[PDB]
């Protein structure tokens, strides 16, 4: 058993510390005016001082192509992790497993901090707020819990009679939307736990929900090939649009924080950009996932780039304006990637398999050789 009561030896820990990078940028940005003023991080291991976080190099977003492996983070009960979030302080990392546990993993140095028995069902959804206040979760059972920053259990309520698969949140603490496997998107009142409205007319089980950061748009994705992507209108309840995008089973749908770009993972080996103000045409598609693309996460301080999971555990990195992918791990993260979550500083990325593990991914260090088993197996 594991209860913190038996003694273990003293150990130094694998540290990915952003503090020597963030301090460096503060010293920089005084005498830096742009990125065209920045001193170059020459490729050698001696230039470990000159790293700035990705806010320092807004230009050149290939900074945050996090292919350097850090740490497999596995539990002692070996359940496959589904959702992964960082605390918006960048302090820890709550992670959802099939037995309904929230293992809070550390941030600068990763250890473990506590276990929870949160859900009676496999966890399926996890989002924080725009302030750090409230965390939203959801599961296979239909129960949605509110969580604080100290992970207090708040009043829980059966939001759905069948398995929720997402929950995203309005630009406030007032409104959010959960889609489930009954096929509906139900938009919720935050405080009253009151069922505002049901967005029917969808056809089959909808497994993702997004909310547009300003305009109040609920975007969804579907297994139903007839009604795959629906925009919605949260105050009225009417179907605003319908976008026929994918041949089967749209997995995860994410909008930028700039408010224009729709991004859509799907089981036909594709990620697609849609400008949401022009649904007639189509922006670029993203080809390179040799099996199905099951997880997608936009980069926080770089609009333009995102990481894109695979059902073969393939972990790929893209960029808007760039047709083929940038980073690459194949046969490397083993299993089926369910979710990704960047650190708030966009410098270290997480993962999560259908195998029982959940690896962590920092940026490539200067002047190392990528002979690692993820990058070049030689």
């Amino acid at each position: 058993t594991f209860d913190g009561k038996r003694m273990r030896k003293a150990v130094n820990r694998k540290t990915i510390d952003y503090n020597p990078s963030v301090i460096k940028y503060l010293e920089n940005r005084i005498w830096q005016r742009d990125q065209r003023d920045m001193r170059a991080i020459q490729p050698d291991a001696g230039y470990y001082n000159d790293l700035v976080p990705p806010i320092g190099m807004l230009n050149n977003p290939m900074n945050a192509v996090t292919t350097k492996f850090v740490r497999t983070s596995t539990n002692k009960v070996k359940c496959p992790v589904f959702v992964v979030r960082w605390t918006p302080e960048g302090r820890r990392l709550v992670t959802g497993a099939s037995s309904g546990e929230f293992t809070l993993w550390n941030g600068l140095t990763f250890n473990f901090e506590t276990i929870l028995q949160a859900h009676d069902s496999p966890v399926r959804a996890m989002t924080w707020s725009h302030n750090d206040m409230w965390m939203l979760t959801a599961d296979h059972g239909g129960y949605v819990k509110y969580w604080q920053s100290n992970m207090n259990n708040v009043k829980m309520f059966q939001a759905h009679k069948e398995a929720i698969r997402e929950a995203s949140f309005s630009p406030t603490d007032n409104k959010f939307a959960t889609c489930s496997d009954d096929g509906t998107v139900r938009i919720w009142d935050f405080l009253r736990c009151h069922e505002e409205r049901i967005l029917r007319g969808h056809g089959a089980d909808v497994k993702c929900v997004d909310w547009h950061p300003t305009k109040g748009l609920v975007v969804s994705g579907s297994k139903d090939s007839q009604q795959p992507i629906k925009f919605w209108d949260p105050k009225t309840g009417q179907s605003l649009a319908t976008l026929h995008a994918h041949k089967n089973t749209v997995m995860e749908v994410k909008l930028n924080l700039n408010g224009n770009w729709l991004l859509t993972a799907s089981r036909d080996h594709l990620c697609k950009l849609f400008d949401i103000r022009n649904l007639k045409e189509e922006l670029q598609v993203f080809r390179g996932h040799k099996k199905e693309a099951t997880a997608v996460a936009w980069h926080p301080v770089h609009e333009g780039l995102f990481a894109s999971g695979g059902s073969d555990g393939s972990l790929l990195f893209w960029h808007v304006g760039v047709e083929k992918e940038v980073g690459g791990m194949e046969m490397a993260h083993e299993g089926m990637i369910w979710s990704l979550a960047w650190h708030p500083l966009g410098h270290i990325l997480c993962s999560g398999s259908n195998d029982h593990t959940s690896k962590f991914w920092t940026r490539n260090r200067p002047g190392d050789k990528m002979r690692d088993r993820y990058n070049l197996n030689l």
Partner: protein
């Protein structure tokens, strides 16, 4: 809730610098600019307070200058200024006689949301370059939209070449210059079509490229003549080499290239960090171990380029030329050290200007020594409260005893100006506080005069 902003000190510190015909065609005049302020300095040589930069006109803008180029238009008696302001505003201005102000010639607002392709957060600054023959001028709006201003009213209507809809899929521009020679405004454009980071060079070895697009002004097409495609991954600014040699030098961080259309590539390496990072054929520059990442440069009439490095070290690169006007080898010399610059200008031949934010941006003077090594001397220095990182209010220590019982606080500020080799404290004190050495009490008198008697 309400406030008034008032600006107590105009911003000292020059981000842009040129040498144009601002007041008339007879004399050139050093037009330098900073954040939201333009300055035009003349040149004294017989000054009492010897050479000295004399200010001639200074101008305040309601907007930060993001680039600045100049071109003498058709039949004009002065040299216009192509300013560039944030979110893609061009503004062609001129000095006017009569009213001693400016005079706007043209206003070009390019802040259209379809010119961004959705990218809200503008990261690229709009960059203004001119064709040295004065045929056209090109602004790189938002990184992806070459706005061309044709020249001959003295103007023609502009147009927006899409960058990403060219050949070669340019997609990450680093620098762009108008090259010399030619019959049409050829514009070299460095880019990175498959972008990498110094720190990730084992799967992405060297991805920088060049397209010398040739602008047809009338027909409004653009042939992408001449492309190279495996330049080192970390190339900083490109630079157009003038007419009698032609071509381009392309500063990389750890190397330095000389590229041309009919000549094979020739480029040397400046340290042994080019070993596992570059597949481009690099020789070994003997007796030199430096880097070129933030290094401003200008050209001596032909075959001599003044590189001021990071660290403020001036190198005068000599391009050694064959009899067929081709570059054979390079030749460095460690010339003197000077200001941590942000710009560079050749003035009247034998004078250089080092425009700098962080440091007193000063006027130099190179001479020939008794191949052709140049020795530098500082003639004048424009005073420059630099990037004030922190600043604290202090009390001065020589307040005279007559002013002592004054009710207001009497204080100054000490300012952490500059950076690095030009770092400083600056003692800023707005009013003037005299030293009373002798006082008198003479009532009844109301005026006073002083004369001189032997």
């Amino acid at each position: 809730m309400y406030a008034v902003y008032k600006q107590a000190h105009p911003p000292t510190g020059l981000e842009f610098s040129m040498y144009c015909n601002f007041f008339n065609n007879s004399e050139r005049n050093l037009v330098v600019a900073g954040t939201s302020q333009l300055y035009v300095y003349r040149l004294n040589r017989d000054a009492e307070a010897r050479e000295k930069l004399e200010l001639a006109a200074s101008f305040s803008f309601f907007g930060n200058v993001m680039s600045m180029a100049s071109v003498q238009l058709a039949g004009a008696k002065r040299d216009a200024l192509l300013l560039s302001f944030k979110d893609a505003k061009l503004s062609v201005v001129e000095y006017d006689p009569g009213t001693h102000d400016l005079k706007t010639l043209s206003l070009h607002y390019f802040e259209e949301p379809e010119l961004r392709d959705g990218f809200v957060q503008n990261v690229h600054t709009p960059r203004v370059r001119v064709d040295p023959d004065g045929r056209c001028a090109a602004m790189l709006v938002y990184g992806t939209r070459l706005v061309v201003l044709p020249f001959r009213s003295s103007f023609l209507p502009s147009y927006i070449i899409d960058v990403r809809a060219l050949d070669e899929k340019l997609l990450n521009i680093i620098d762009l210059q108008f090259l010399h020679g030619y019959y049409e405004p050829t514009l070299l454009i460095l880019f990175e079509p498959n972008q990498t980071w110094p720190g990730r060079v084992a799967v992405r070895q060297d991805t920088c490229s060049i397209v010398a697009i040739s602008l047809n002004i009338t027909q409004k097409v653009h042939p992408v003549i001449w492309s190279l495609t495996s330049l080192p991954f970390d190339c900083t600014q490109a630079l157009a080499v003038p007419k009698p040699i032609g071509g381009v030098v392309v500063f990389a961080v750890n190397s330095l290239l000389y590229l041309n259309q009919s000549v094979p590539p020739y480029g040397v390496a400046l340290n042994s960090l080019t070993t596992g990072t570059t597949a481009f054929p690099l020789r070994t520059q003997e007796g030199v171990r430096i880097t070129l990442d933030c290094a401003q440069a200008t050209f001596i009439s032909y075959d001599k380029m003044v590189i001021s490095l990071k660290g403020g070290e001036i190198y005068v690169l000599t391009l050694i030329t064959d009899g067929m006007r081709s570059v054979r080898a390079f030749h460095f010399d460690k010339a003197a050290a000077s200001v941590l610059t942000t710009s560079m200008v050749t003035m009247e031949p034998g004078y250089l200007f080092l425009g700098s934010r962080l440091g007193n941006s000063l006027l130099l003077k190179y001479t020939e020594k008794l191949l052709a090594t140049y020795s530098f001397e500082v003639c004048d220095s424009i005073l420059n409260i630099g990037p004030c990182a922190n600043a604290a209010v202090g009390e001065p220590a020589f307040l005279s005893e007559e002013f002592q019982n004054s009710p207001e606080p009497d204080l100054e500020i000490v300012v952490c100006s500059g950076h690095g080799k030009n770092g400083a404290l600056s003692v800023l004190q707005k009013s003037i506080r005299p030293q009373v050495v002798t006082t008198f009490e003479l009532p009844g008198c109301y005026d006073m005069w002083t004369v001189i008697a032997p």
